[PDB]
C-alpha cells in the first residue's frame, strides 16, 4: 500500500541519490502492447538504476502517491521485494520505490491499483515495464 507506506515520517524527503547509478529508459505497456497511459504519465522515464555488490536496484519515481494504492512488481512471475526509500510532501507527492533485478532482465510486469480517498478502486491487472536495455549490475563501480 503506497498510500499507507508514505505515512512514515522518516521517509519524508530522505536521501536516495548517493550511489553509483545509471540512466535506463523504458516503456510502460498494457496487455495489448499499447502505451499504458496512466503509468506513462505517473512513472518517470528514465528510471535510475543503482549498483550494489549483489544485485542492481532499479528506482522508480511515481507521482500522486496519495492515490496509488497497490503496486506489486514481478520478475519472471515472482514478486520482487519493493521498498520505499523516499517521499515528497502533499504538493509534489512523488514517491520513490526500489527493488532488485537479476542480471539480463529487460522486462517485468506491474500489478497495480489506484484509489482516491475511500472511493472506487481502479484496477490495472497487467502493466508490462520493458526497459530499452537489459539491466546488468556492476560491482566495480
Amino acid at each position: 500500500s503506497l498510500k499507507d507506506a508514505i505515512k512514515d515520517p522518516a521517509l519524508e524527503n530522505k536521501e536516495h541519490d548517493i550511489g553509483p547509478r545509471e540512466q535506463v529508459n523504458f516503456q510502460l505497456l498494457d496487455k495489448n502492447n499499447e502505451t499504458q497511459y496512466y503509468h506513462f504519465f505517473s512513472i518517470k522515464d528514465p528510471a535510475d538504476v543503482y549498483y550494489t555488490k549483489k544485485k542492481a536496484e532499479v528506482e522508480l519515481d511515481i507521482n500522486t502517491a496519495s492515490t496509488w494504492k497497490k503496486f506489486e512488481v514481478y520478475e519472471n512471475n515472482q514478486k520482487l521485494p519493493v521498498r520505499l526509500v523516499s517521499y515528497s510532501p502533499v504538493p509534489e507527492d512523488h514517491a520513490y520505490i526500489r527493488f532488485p533485478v537479476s542480471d539480463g532482465t529487460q522486462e517485468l510486469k506491474i500489478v497495480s491499483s489506484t484509489q482516491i480517498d475511500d472511493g472506487e478502486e481502479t484496477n490495472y491487472d497487467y502493466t508490462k515495464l520493458v526497459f530499452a536495455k537489459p539491466i546488468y549490475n556492476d560491482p566495480s563501480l
Binding site: T35, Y37, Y38, F40, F41, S42, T64, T67, V90, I116
Partner: peptide
Amino acid sequence: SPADKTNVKAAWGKVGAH
C-alpha cells in the same frame, strides 16, 4: 489536489491515441 491530478491523468489516459 492529488485527487484532481489523478482524475486528469486517468481521463486523458482514456483518450489515449485520439
